[PDB]
């Protein structure tokens, strides 16, 4: 089971809104090279390689943990779409 899945289902009014939020956040992380993450260095999800631990490349695991922190705001009509795009491109270049 996804860690903390019951809490995530508690955070939304419809289980499918949780999925929309998580997938959008994962695409946001993928586009900006994870530079906009709300996770501290210790909260970063890790992946065990042959050499040693590395950053988990799965943007969805990241998005779900970020949602679990509470440091994310989700809802309808928060900001015009292109405004959000350009502000995230300014704060985090590609």
């Amino acid at each position: 089971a996804e860690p903390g899945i019951d809490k995530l289902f508690g955070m939304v009014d419809s289980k499918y809104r949780l999925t929309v939020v998580v997938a959008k956040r994962a695409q946001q992380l993928l586009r900006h090279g994870f530079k906009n993450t709300v996770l501290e260095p210790e909260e970063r999800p890790k992946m065990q390689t042959l050499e040693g631990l590395f950053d988990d490349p799965n943007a969805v695991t990241w998005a779900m943990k970020e949602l679990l922190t509470g440091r994310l705001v989700f809802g309808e009509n928060l900001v015009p779409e292109d405004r959000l795009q350009k502000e995230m491109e300014r704060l985090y270049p590609v």
Binding site: E2, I5, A23, A26, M47, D56, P57, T61
Partner: protein, 158 residues
Amino acid sequence: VVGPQLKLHQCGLPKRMALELFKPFLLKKMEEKGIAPNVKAARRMLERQRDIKDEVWDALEEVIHGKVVLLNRAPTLHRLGIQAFQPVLVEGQSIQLHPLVCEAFNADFDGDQMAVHVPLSSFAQAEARIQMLSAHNLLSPASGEPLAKPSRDIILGL
């Protein structure tokens, strides 16, 4: 094939299947590491079986990290005929199915086969991991009673 060591959210996926199923991801990750100069060279390297070395399998491990595949068994009588699993790479050529999901697929191990599907996008992967993962669909949509529940040997030993 039954895998009783799996956790409810896992299945056993052969290496030679997962290589082909995830092949573009594998080309990209092979280029990220030193395994090939470019994508075309990585594809040419995977073309022949004797040209494949262990770094390819270790990079395939990183390709699939956190991802889920869909397992389907015909006939798909209800929505639990498709369920999402984190693939555990195994030697051999047989898919390893968790015992507690058998009943929901109506699957036994007297020769049955199952289809595997790779959800590509982050959106499809989020749908699969949240909505269709096996460990989240524990109760029947039809009656609400437990569907993934102890069966046969489990009940016998208990």
